[PDB]
Amino acid sequence: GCTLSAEDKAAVERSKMIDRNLREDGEKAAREVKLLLLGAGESGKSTIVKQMKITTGIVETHFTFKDLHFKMFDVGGQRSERKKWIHCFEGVTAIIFCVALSDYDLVLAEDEEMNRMHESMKLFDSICNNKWFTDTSIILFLNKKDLFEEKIKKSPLTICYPEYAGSNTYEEAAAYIQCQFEDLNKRKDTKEIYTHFTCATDTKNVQFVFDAVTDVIIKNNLKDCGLF
Amino acid sequence: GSELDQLRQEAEQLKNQIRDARKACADATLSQITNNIDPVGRIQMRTRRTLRGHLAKIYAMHWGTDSRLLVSASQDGKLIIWDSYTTNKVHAIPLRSSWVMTCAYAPSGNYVACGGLDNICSIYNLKTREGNVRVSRELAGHTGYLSCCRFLDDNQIVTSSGDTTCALWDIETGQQTTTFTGHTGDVMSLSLAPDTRLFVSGACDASAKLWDVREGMCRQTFTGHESDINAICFFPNGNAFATGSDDATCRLFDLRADQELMTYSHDNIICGITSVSFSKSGRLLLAGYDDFNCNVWDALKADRAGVLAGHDNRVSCLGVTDDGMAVATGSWDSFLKIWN
Amino acid sequence: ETLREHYQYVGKLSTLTTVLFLVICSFIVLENLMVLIAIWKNNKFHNRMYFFIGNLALCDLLAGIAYKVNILMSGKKTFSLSPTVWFLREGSMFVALGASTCSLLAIAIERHLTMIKMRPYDANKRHRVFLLIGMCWLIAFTLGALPILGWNCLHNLPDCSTILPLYSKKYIAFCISIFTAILVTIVILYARIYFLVKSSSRKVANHNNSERSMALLRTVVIVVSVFIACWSPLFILFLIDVACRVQACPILFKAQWFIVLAVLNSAMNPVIYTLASKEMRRAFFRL
Amino acid sequence: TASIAQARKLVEQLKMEANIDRIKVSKAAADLMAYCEAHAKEDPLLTPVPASENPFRE
Amino acid sequence: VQLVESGGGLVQPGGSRKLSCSASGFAFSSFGMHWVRQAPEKGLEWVAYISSGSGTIYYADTVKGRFTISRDDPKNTLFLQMTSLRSEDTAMYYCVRSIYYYGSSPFDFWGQGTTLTVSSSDIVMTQATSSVPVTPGESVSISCRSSKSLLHSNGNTYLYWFLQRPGQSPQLLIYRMSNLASGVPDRFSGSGSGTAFTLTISRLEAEDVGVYYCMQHLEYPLTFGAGTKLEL
Ligand SMILES: O=C(c1cc(C2CC2)on1)N(C1CCCCC1)C1CCCCC1
Ligand SMILES: CCCCCCCCCCCCCCCC(=O)O
Ligand SMILES: CCCCCCCCCCCCCCCC(=O)O
């Protein structure tokens, strides 16, 4: 202010006010849990969108649970190269993957060479081995279990897994599918995968999401404060 | 099958004739001609100013027409106008979608363009009777992520999207007046010519296409990369341009002669280029890399003359004033630095 | 004359031990300087823990340097020292060790506040770190400067202590109360952090979560146990001095021995607070 | 007959693009060198001007 | 955009009066405000200034500590409280909005003001002439003087040229001695040099008659000059 005119002082005051507003906005916005919802082909994506809810490039969902604000990003309809816009979700808290295990005997809608489960596994492997998600937790959400249970009785899962020999029941097949999906993980130390089976009640799904995000938050806070 | 094969053979033999003419006219490369000049010894730029206030990765910026103001965009959802002389904020604009990848500043200084993953280009009017900033026009004709946009004039804009198409719009009406469909991959950047009649555009298929604004056809094409293209800018003269790829290499192409004048790359660098900009006289080329610092190359000798190592993260946006006196660089650490 | 009589009332009237203390202080000061320069090497000051760790290292260095001059003057200037400078020399120890113990309390407070709020991301919130550091320093200076200017045991002799003849019993008891309150608060905070972490991690019941909980338990146990083991003997000695009468207890003579244990704690803080966390250990190894 | 229209359009575009002319590389190199030399005096970054005229001095 | 005033009337020498100004049609929360006085049959004088966010408050030297200014952003209302009114406090009062940033033009809108009658160092601005008869169709020039150089070290001159038509609120013509206002014809122009300032009109119409004033903003208090009257 020694060599600053009155207009310069007013400009400085305006800049300080803008700085204060920006800092307030950043502090307000730095307390929301961001989740990235992603699925492969025709899965139960919108299904869990309706369970958890209770501009076509990206879909924004906002909701609350136990005084926790969740912002879900559904970028299924981007229809572009994933490697050119996936780095903007680097700071996401968790990735909610979508797999329906009732499509083991159903071939792709474009060709019969493979069935949908193999494409789901191939895309899960690509997501897990991403360079931007080395320490990003993933939730599995294996849904449509009822149709799989009905279909496993008439047709076994040996077609999808020719090297698998089991009791061909529901529990054993579900355990095998979960184990195969978990084995796709390559790190197993920096990141973890949470598996859940969806039910007809929204409460189970929302509680599982809340528990997973709380665990991720605790791990991140422990890393930040240097207790681990 | 037979028709397709014969047509591909015809295209290949036209390409062979074109490259034969290129080799016949290429008696000496640019390096051979320019080796006789005196190279610059060493240039050192210091950070005169350090703009701070962003809380997310900065993805785009544009210098003002008067070489005094600039604009900046990040993922925080804020578009900030900076005064580069006294480090003052003139305007802060909230964004409807925080996923933004480009921003432009009008030559007249009245409008600002923004866009990103929302597939919508938004125009904001600065000089308004009211004390705030309001949205003037919204473009929603694209079906892919917007990667770059530049004001053609006070009334026309040109945008590049992720749907392998480019669009020249009309702000007053709000509908596309020209559509350019010649790319087989996502388009990442564009740059307007100084004479304001043509523009080059780079995409992910390792090809740069030169388009005519008035007519709207594939005027020219260039293929010299092995990976995607991230940045492109015209030469100050306007008869040449420079492109940066993800293979840690930049190339210099000429509009009049379809050539590859120079390749700027070094064995030490293994990471690609995010931003490319030129100097006022076209002697210094500024390239932002993924290795957390920028680089300066003498355009006539393809050698490094300086490193602007002042950023703690990957740099994404770089700009030079119209008078060519200051260099503004932004990075993912939410810090803007004016080197001089 | 006053010093001679004061020493006479309490009955206060080897080279190897002296050089051992000298070299121990040398290790303390060199370790603190190395930690300080390692911290200053890293320019990534976004983390709030950096401020606290640097403050702790600086205070440990100050305490070591102060003990150096204190022990050399005690060895040499037994009675030539002016009475006024004696109080400054004694209060330097109190200031240094008060600022080298409240720093741990501030670190515990910061950790508890960070881990108690369910914040997925980090805000600046530097008005808390600055306030904590300021209070940590100011309390230490106030406590150190209180006995010389405030109540004292100089002319009358109702309460002059044995280890330090000029100091009164009540001030020592106040210091003991402050120290035990700090220790209890630190223990309670660490126990609460462990309980919250275990309760949060119980629900998912993963192998990685169980390993993390066990590692946190071990780290907290080590952190609390080392501090208690290092700082207990001086607490016991001062409690005995407060309880015991004048010249009644013949074990109070080798008080300096217990003192070196309090110095030994200054060695453990750089190792525990920097070499036990992944990021800090990596930064120290790189530097 | 449905999948040949795209190929026909592509080859038409190629035959339209191939009709443009070419110039010598040395001419472009000389033009760029002359442009660089002519405007070198008006380049603050290339030639460090005295700090008195610099508005960015601190 | 508009601002309307209230509170004027007849006041005895001993008493208090609050003048209110309400603004509609723009963002009042980001515009600094000025209270400006204008004595009848005499030039206009500054009263008070309040900055955005109620951070900086400036009062007139002769009425320092004697008037009070306050701002309300939720209601967009500006209050001027007056405790004592002597025989020299009879004049018109105007509220002027002004926003300060790079490229901004302070003193854009003047409102309408209200009258107030009572029942009875600083750079000086002066103009030699006070009444210049002239016919339409010829260029005219109005001159203002200063006691000190108005060119700040930043590189701009804090000089303004206004217009006050008979029976109309004052408006802005030239800001910073070289820049034209918005909504005014290009005929008016300004030229400053040292302590001599000239407002020039190339083509004169019947709407250009009125009293012109020269304005300075280098420092506070803002001492003003006498206007020059152009009549048809
Ligand atoms: O600061 C010391 C201290 C002073 C000395 C001097 C003689 C060498 O030793 N410990 N205490 C001692 C008093 C309590 C028991 C052991 C520590 C406190 C003071 C309150 C806050 C910090 C701890
Ligand atoms: C230096 C340690 C001893 C003195 C400690 C005094 C300050 C303790 C922390 C006060 C602020 C944090 C607790 C209040 C609640 C909050 O604002 O989060
Ligand atoms: C020597 C003074 C000792 C004072 C001991 C009592 C106060 C210690 C600080 C208490 C911190 C409480 C933190 C609460 C955190 C929260 O509410 O989220």
Can you walk me through this structure?
Chain C: It is found in: Cell membrane. Chain C: Keywords: Cell membrane, G-protein coupled receptor, Glycoprotein, Membrane, Phosphoprotein, Receptor, Transducer, Transmembrane, Transmembrane helix. Helix content of chain A is 41%, strand content 15%. By secondary structure, chain A is α/β, with parallel strands linked by helices. Chain A has a single domain, classed as 3-Layer(aba) Sandwich (Rossmann fold), CATH 3.40.50.300. In chain A, strands 1, 2, 3, 4, 5, 6 and 7 form a seven-stranded mixed sheet that branches. Chain B is mainly beta and 340 residues long. Chain B has a single domain, classed as Methylamine Dehydrogenase, Chain H, CATH 2.130.10. Chain B has helices spanning 2-25, 30-34; strands spanning 47-52, 58-63, 69-74, 78-83, 88-94, 100-105, 111-116, 121-125, 134-139, 146-151, 157-161, 166-168, 178-180, 187-192, 198-203, 208-212, 218-222, 229-234, 240-245, 250-254, 260-264, 273-278, 284-289, 294-298, 303-306, 315-320, 327-331, 335-339. In chain B, the strands form seven sheets. Chain B has a four-stranded antiparallel sheet with strand order 1-28-27-26, with no helix packed on it. Chain B has a four-stranded antiparallel sheet with strand order 2-3-4-5, with no helix packed on it. Chain C has 287 residues and is mainly alpha-helical. Chain C has a single domain (2-286), classed as Rhopdopsin 7-helix transmembrane proteins. Chain C has helices at residues 2-9, 15-41, 49-76, 83-99, 102-116, 126-149, 169-202, 207-243, 255-275, 278-286. In chain C, α3 packs antiparallel against α4 (83-99), α4 (83-99) packs antiparallel against α6 (126-149) and α8 (207-243) packs antiparallel against α9 (255-275). Chain E is mainly β and 232 residues long. Chain E has strands at 2-6, 10-11, 17-24, 32-38, 44-50, 57-59, 67-72, 77-82, 91-98, 114-118, 125-126, 140-146, 159-163, 171-175, 179-180, 188-193, 196-201, 210-212, 214-216, 228-230. In chain E, the strands form five sheets. Chain E has a six-stranded mixed sheet with strand order 2-10-9-4-5-6, with no helix packed on it. Chain E has a four-stranded antiparallel sheet with strand order 1-3-8-7, with no helix packed on it. Chain E has a four-stranded antiparallel sheet with strand order 11-12-17-16, with no helix packed on it. Chain E is globular. At the B-D interface, α1, α2 and β17 of B face α1 and α2 of D. Residues 102, 105-106, 109, 113, 128, 132, 135-136 of chain C line the site of one palmitic acid (PLM). Residues 102, 105-106, 109, 113, 128, 132, 135-136 of chain C line the site of one palmitic acid.
The main pleated sheet of chain B reads as: 4 strands, antiparallel
CATH homologous superfamily grouping of chain B: YVTN repeat-like/Quinoprotein amine dehydrogenase
Name of the level-1 CATH class of chain B: Mainly Beta
Shape estimate of chain B: globular
What level of helicity do the residues of chain B show?
under 10%
By CATH, the topology of chain C is: Rhopdopsin 7-helix transmembrane proteins
Give the second-level CATH assignment, the architecture of chain C.
Answer: Up-down Bundle
Identify the bound ligands: N,N-dicyclohexyl-5-cyclopropyl-1,2-oxazole-3-carboxamide, palmitic acid
Rg measurement of chain C, Å:
21 Å
Strand content of chain B: 35-45%
Distance between the termini of chain C: 53 Å
Please tally the β strands of chain C and state the result. 0
Q: State the CATH architecture of chain B.
A: 7 Propeller
How many structural domains does the protein architecture of chain C include?
1
Distance between the termini of chain B: 60 Å
The CATH homology group name of chain C: Rhodopsin 7-helix transmembrane proteins
Number of strands of chain B: 28
Helix and strand string of chain B, N-terminal first? HHEEEEEEEEEEEEEEEEEEEEEEEEEEEE
Number of domains of chain B: 1
Structural class, from helix and strand content of chain B?
A: mainly beta
Protein name (chain B): Guanine nucleotide-binding protein G(I)/G(S)/G(T) subunit beta-1
Pfam families (chain B): WD40_Gbeta
Family (chain B): Belongs to the WD repeat G protein beta family.
Modified residues (Phosphohistidine) (chain B): 266
